[PDB]
Scaffold this active site. Structure first.
Site, PDB file in Angstrom:
ATOM      1  N   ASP A  48      41.308  39.724  45.976  1.00  0.00           N
ATOM      2  CA  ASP A  48      41.882  39.948  44.626  1.00  0.00           C
ATOM      3  C   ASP A  48      42.385  38.607  44.085  1.00  0.00           C
ATOM      4  OD1 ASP A  48      43.381  41.458  42.374  1.00  0.00           O
ATOM      5  OD2 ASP A  48      42.521  43.087  43.596  1.00  0.00           O
ATOM      6  N   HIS A  73      39.302  40.488  39.039  1.00  0.00           N
ATOM      7  CA  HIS A  73      40.113  40.406  40.283  1.00  0.00           C
ATOM      8  C   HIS A  73      39.534  39.306  41.186  1.00  0.00           C
ATOM      9  CE1 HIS A  73      42.951  43.630  39.491  1.00  0.00           C
ATOM     10  NE2 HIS A  73      41.945  44.278  38.892  1.00  0.00           N
ATOM     11  N   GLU A 100      39.330  46.839  35.763  1.00  0.00           N
ATOM     12  CA  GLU A 100      40.232  45.926  35.011  1.00  0.00           C
ATOM     13  C   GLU A 100      39.606  44.535  34.888  1.00  0.00           C
ATOM     14  OE1 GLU A 100      43.688  46.300  37.478  1.00  0.00           O
ATOM     15  OE2 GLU A 100      44.550  47.902  36.231  1.00  0.00           O
TER      16      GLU A 100
HETATM   17  C1  LIG Z   1      41.403  50.230  40.411  1.00  0.00           C
HETATM   18  C2  LIG Z   1      42.848  49.875  40.252  1.00  0.00           C
HETATM   19  O1  LIG Z   1      43.705  50.716  40.446  1.00  0.00           O
HETATM   20  N1  LIG Z   1      43.111  48.607  39.913  1.00  0.00           N
HETATM   21  C3  LIG Z   1      44.458  48.022  39.758  1.00  0.00           C
HETATM   22  C4  LIG Z   1      45.078  47.603  41.097  1.00  0.00           C
HETATM   23  O2  LIG Z   1      44.759  46.229  41.361  1.00  0.00           O
HETATM   24  C5  LIG Z   1      46.595  47.812  41.080  1.00  0.00           C
HETATM   25  O3  LIG Z   1      47.173  47.392  42.319  1.00  0.00           O
HETATM   26  C6  LIG Z   1      46.913  49.291  40.827  1.00  0.00           C
HETATM   27  C7  LIG Z   1      48.412  49.526  40.604  1.00  0.00           C
HETATM   28  O4  LIG Z   1      48.820  50.741  41.250  1.00  0.00           O
HETATM   29  O5  LIG Z   1      46.169  49.827  39.718  1.00  0.00           O
HETATM   30  C8  LIG Z   1      45.425  48.889  38.923  1.00  0.00           C
HETATM   31  O6  LIG Z   1      46.329  48.024  38.209  1.00  0.00           O
END
Ligand SMILES: CC(=O)N[C@@H]1[C@@H](O)[C@H](O)[C@@H](CO)O[C@H]1O
Ligand SMILES: [Ca+2]
Ligand SMILES: [Cu+2]
Length: 751
Positions: free
Chosen positions: A176, A246, A310
Site C-alpha cells: 500500500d 495504493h 480508491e
Molecule cells: C477496499 C478498501 O476498503 N480500501 C480502503 C482501505 O485502504 C482502508 O484501510 C479501509 C478503511 O477501513 O477502507 C478504504 O479506505
C-alpha cells in the site's frame, strides 16, 4: 469427570445423539490414520496437539484402519462438498470420515471445540452422529500488513486463529501507500526504499507525527513459509498487490512509474493518495507483468487479488501520456463511465489477460466495475453489497466483504471512549451475526454467483498483534457461523449461549479477545402497578451475579441475584459477574427515588416528537441522564413549555421539586428560562406555590448538566403541575439569534 458438548461454533448441519454409553477419553487411547498419507498423519498430529491443551495427556499416533479404544481418521462418503465430514461416536470408538484431508481437519476442529479445557481429567464423549459441510466454498479473513507490519510468527498465529473457525482463505494485503512488504528480485528498491517511511502520523491525520522510521518486509522464502504453513491447515493464501492506486511505496522506489515523475515519499499518514501508477507509461505495464510474474511463483493460489480500490483519476486527467492512451484506444465519456474509468478498465484487463495466460484468475475490489468489468474477473464487494449485486447480475463470481457488516477495523462497542483508538464506525457482534450474505434482491440463479464471505482487518490504528486479536475475536466466531452454517439454523440467543465454550479455546491458545459479550446486561423497567423500578440482570453463560445497593464494591461475598430487584427507595446500584477466569465490568446506576417515581404523569403541552423516546413517563422512572442528550434518559420540548401533571394518588405533604437539564448550545440546546410548581386537590384547578426565572445563557456558560431545585413551605397536594420554559428567543450573541431553542429534562424529583 468432564463431558464433551457438540453445541459448538460454527453449528453443524445435523447432530443426532442416542441413549448408548459414551466414549471415555483416557490414557491408552490411540489416533489412527491411513498408511503413507502425509496430510492425514499431519491431521493426526493436530488432533494430538489439541487433545494435549484440552486434557493434560499425550495420545500415540499410529497407521491403521481398525482399532479398539481408538480415534480413526479416514477418507470416504460423497465428494458433492469436498469440505464435508462425518463424526460418529460409540462406546467402542470414534470415526472422522471426509471425502478430502481438509474435511477430516474440519471434523477434527469439531471434536476439538466439543472438548472442555480440563487438565489431568478423563472426558466423556456422548454417543452421536454428526453430518456437516460448509455453505460457502470461500471463507476468508483479510490482513493489512502495509499500514502496520506484522512478523512471520504473528501471521502464523492469525492462520491458527482462521483454522479454529474453519476458515480456508487468508487475503494477504502486502503492499500500500505506507509500505511495500514483498522482496521482488527485478526491482530491489521496492524493499530498500519502498518498505520504509520517515514516521507515522498520531491519531486520525492530526498533524502530530511519530518521527520513528518504520519498516519491514518478507523475503520470498519467508512468504513461501506462510504459504506452506497455511497449506498444512487447508488455507489458500490469496495475495494482493493493489493496483493501480495504493502504490506510493512503488512510486517512492521508482518515480518514473508516476504521472508527474515525483518527488514521491512512502506515506506517513492514512487515506487515499492521488499519486497512482501512470496507465499511459509502457514501463508501468511491464513493471506489473514482472512483479506478478514473481508473485505467482511464490503463491500457487488459482485466484490472485489485483485490488483496484480508491484510484483517483485526477492525475490521469492532467497527464499527457494517460490522455494519449485514451485518445489512441478511442475511450469516451458517456452516462456509464468517464474516459479515465475506461482507462482503469484497460489496466485491469491488461493484468487479467497476463494472469489468465499463466493459468490464474483475478479478484478485484468493486471499483473494477468502473469502465466495464474484465470478462473473467471475480468482484470483492466492500462499498456495501451493491457492487456484488451488480456483478452477480452480469454473471461474475462475487466475494462479499461489505463494510456495513464485515470491516473489523470498526469499533465493536457504542462507548468508543473505553475502546482502543480506531477508525470509527459501529460493528457489534449482533450486527455481524444478522448478516445474510445472499441478497433478497437476487433471483435464485443470480445467488449461485455469491461464492464467498470474508471480514477485512485494515491496520491504520492496529500496531500490536494483541490489538489485532481484540478486533477480530470474537467477531470471527459470528462471521464463521455466517460462512459455514445453513441460514435456517441461525438464532442469536443460541449462538451467544455457545460462545463461552469457544472463548475457553481462545484462553488455552493464548489469544486476546474483546469481552463485551461477558458484561452483565441491565434492564431498568418501570412497574407503576407495584410502584417500583424493576432491575433485571443477565449474562450469556448464566454466571453468578452479585450486587450492592449501598454504593460499596460488589464482590463474591455480596448478595447473589435471584430474580428481578424491585427498587422502592434511593440506591447506588452495582452488579458484577463472578467467573474463575476474571470478573466482568461493574454495571452501576444511581436510582433517584422520590414521591413522584412511578406515579401517573400526563403531558398538558406536547413533548418534542424527534426527542420523545419513551415519553413523559421518562421524567418519573428514577433514572437521571448525563451530558449526552441522545441516550433516551432525556426528552425534549421546543416551541412550548415542559408542562406535566403528576398524580401522587392521595393527598401528600411536599416541600421541594428538582429537575436537571442538558445544555449543548452548539446544537441549539439551551437551559430552562423558568421553573414553576402548582398543586391541586381535584386535578383541574392548580395554585402556584413556587417559581424562579433564570436569565438568558451567555457565550461563556458551560454545556452539560444543570440542576434546578425549588423549596417551599410544606403544602398538601394530590396533583403537582411542574412547568419549565425553554428559550423561546435564542440570545443575540448566538448564530440562531431569535429562533426557539430545545429544552431537555431527565427527571422530576418531589419530596
Ligand atoms: C477496499 C478498501 O476498503 N480500501 C480502503 C482501505 O485502504 C482502508 O484501510 C479501509 C478503511 O477501513 O477502507 C478504504 O479506505
Ligand atoms: Ca428519568
Ligand atoms: Cu499518467
Amino acid at each position: 469427570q468432564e463431558e464433551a458438548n457438540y453445541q459448538i461454533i460454527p453449528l453443524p448441519q445435523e447432530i443426532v445423539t442416542s441413549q448408548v454409553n459414551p466414549f471415555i477419553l483416557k490414557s491408552g487411547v490411540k489416533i489412527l490414520y491411513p498408511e503413507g498419507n502425509e496430510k492425514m498423519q499431519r491431521n493426526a498430529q493436530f488432533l494430538a496437539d489439541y487433545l494435549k491443551t484440552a486434557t493434560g495427556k499425550d495420545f500415540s499416533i499410529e497407521a491403521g484402519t481398525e482399532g479398539k479404544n481408538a480415534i480413526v481418521l479416514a477418507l470416504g462418503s460423497e465428494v458433492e462438498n469436498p469440505e464435508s465430514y462425518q463424526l460418529k461416536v460409540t462406546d467402542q470408538g470414534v470415526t472422522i470420515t471426509a471425502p478430502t484431508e481438509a474435511g477430516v481437519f474440519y471434523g477434527i476442529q469439531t471434536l476439538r471445540k466439543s472438548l472442555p479445557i480440563a487438565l489431568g481429567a478423563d472426558v466423556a464423549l456422548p454417543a452421536v452422529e454428526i453430518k456437516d459441510a460448509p455453505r460457502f466454498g470461500y471463507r476468508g479473513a483479510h490482513f493489512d500488513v502495509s499500514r502496520h507490519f506484522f512478523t512471520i510468527d504473528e501471521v502464523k498465529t492469525y492462520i491458527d486463529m482462521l483454522a479454529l473457525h474453519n476458515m480456508n482463505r487468508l487475503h494477504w494485503h502486502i503492499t500500500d501507500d505506507q509500505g511495500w512488504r514483498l522482496e521482488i528480485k527485478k526491482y530491489p528498491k521496492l524493499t530498500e526504499i519502498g518498505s520504509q517511511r520517515s514516521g507515522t502520523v498520531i491519531g486520525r491525520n492530526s498533524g502530530e507525527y511519530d518521527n520513528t522510521p518504520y519498516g519491514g518486509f518478507y523475503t520470498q522464502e519467508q512468504a513461501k513459509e506462510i504459504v506452506d504453513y497455511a497449506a498444512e491447515r487447508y488455507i489458500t493464501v490469496v495475495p494482493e498487490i493493489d493496483l493501480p492506486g495504493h502504490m506510493l511505496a512503488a512510486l517512492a522506489a521508482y518515480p518514473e512509474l508516476g504521472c508527474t515523475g515525483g518527488p514521491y515519499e512512502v506515506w506517513r499518514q492514512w487515506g487515499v493518495a492521488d499519486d497512482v501508477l501512470c496507465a499511459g507509461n509502457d514501463q508501468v505495464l511491464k513493471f506489473l507483468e514482472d512483479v506478478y510474474g514473481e508473485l505467482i511463483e511464490i503463491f500457487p493460489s488459482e485466484y490472485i487479488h489485483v485490488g483496484g480500490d480508491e484510484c483517483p483519476k485526477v492525475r490521469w486527467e492532467k497527464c499527457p501520456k494517460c490522455q494519449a492512451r485514451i485518445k489512441a484506444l478511442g475511450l469516451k465519456s458517456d452516462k456509464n463511465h468517464s474516459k479515465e474509468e475506461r482507462l482503469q478498465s484497460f489496466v485491469i484487463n491488461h493484468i487479467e489477460k497476463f494472469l489468465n495466460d499463466h493459468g490464474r484468475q483475478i479478484i478485484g475490489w468493486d471499483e473494477i466495475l468502473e469502465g466495464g468489468l474484465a470478462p473473467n474477473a471475480t468482484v470483492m464487494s466492500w462499498r456495501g453489497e451493491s457492487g456484488g449485486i451488480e456483478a452477480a447480475k452480469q454473471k461474475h463470481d462475487v466475494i462479499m466483504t461489505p463494510n456495513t457488516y464485515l470491516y473489523f477495523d470498526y469499533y465493536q462497542a457504542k462507548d468508543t471512549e473505553n475502546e482502543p483508538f480506531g477508525i470509527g464506525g459501529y460493528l457489534p457482534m449482533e450486527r455481524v451475526y444478522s448478516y445474510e450474505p445472499m441478497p433478497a434482491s437476487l433471483t435464485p440463479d443470480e445467488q449461485q454467483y455469491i461464492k464467498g464471505v470474508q471480514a477485512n482487518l485494515w491496520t491504520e490504528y492496529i500496531a500490536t498483534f494483541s490489538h489485532a486479536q481484540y478486533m477480530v475475536l470474537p467477531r470471527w466466531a459470528a462471521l464463521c457461523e455466517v460462512q459455514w452454517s445453513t441460514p435456517d439454523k441461525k438464532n442469536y440467543e443460541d449462538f451467544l449461549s455457545r460462545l463461552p465454550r469457544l472463548i475457553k479455546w481462545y484462553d488455552a491458545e493464548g489469544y486476546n479477545y474483546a469481552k463485551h459479550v461477558f458484561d452483565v446486561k441491565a434492564e431498568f423497567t418501570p412497574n407503576p402497578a407495584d410502584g417500583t423500578l424493576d432491575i433485571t440482570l443477565t449474562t450469556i453463560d448464566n454466571a453468578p451475579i452479585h450486587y450492592t445497593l449501598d454504593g460499596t464494591e460488589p464482590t463474591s461475598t455480596s448478595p447473589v441475584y435471584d430474580g428481578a430487584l424491585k427498587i422502592k427507595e434511593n440506591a447506588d446500584f452495582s452488579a458484577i459477574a463472578i467467573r474463575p477466569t476474571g470478573n466482568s465490568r461493574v454495571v452501576s446506576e444511581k436510582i433517584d427515588f422520590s414521591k413522584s417515581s412511578m406515579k401517573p404523569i400526563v403531558a398538558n403541552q406536547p413533548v418534542n416528537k424527534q426527542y420523545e423516546f419513551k415519553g413523559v413517563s421518562t421524567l418519573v422512572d428514577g433514572l437521571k441522564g448525563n451530558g449526552n442528550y441522545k441516550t433516551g434518559r432525556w426528552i425534549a420540548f421546543r416551541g412550548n413549555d415542559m408542562d406535566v401533571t403528576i398524580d401522587l394518588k392521595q393527598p401528600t405533604e411536599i416541600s421541594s421539586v428538582a429537575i436537571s437539564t442538558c445544555v449543548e448550545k452548539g446544537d441549539w440546546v439551551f437551559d430552562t428560562r423558568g421553573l414553576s410548581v402548582e398543586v391541586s386537590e381535584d386535578g383541574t384547578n392548580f395554585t402556584k406555590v413556587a417559581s424562579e426565572a433564570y436569565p438568558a445563557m451567555k457565550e461563556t456558560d458551560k454545556n452539560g448538566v444543570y440542576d434546578h431545585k425549588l423549596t417551599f413551605t410544606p403544602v398538601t397536594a394530590q396533583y403537582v403541575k411542574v412547568i419549565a420554559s425553554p428559550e423561546k428567543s435564542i440570545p443575540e450573541w448566538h448564530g440562531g439569534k431569535s429562533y426557539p431553542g430545545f429544552l431537555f429534562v431527565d427527571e422530576i424529583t418531589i419530596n
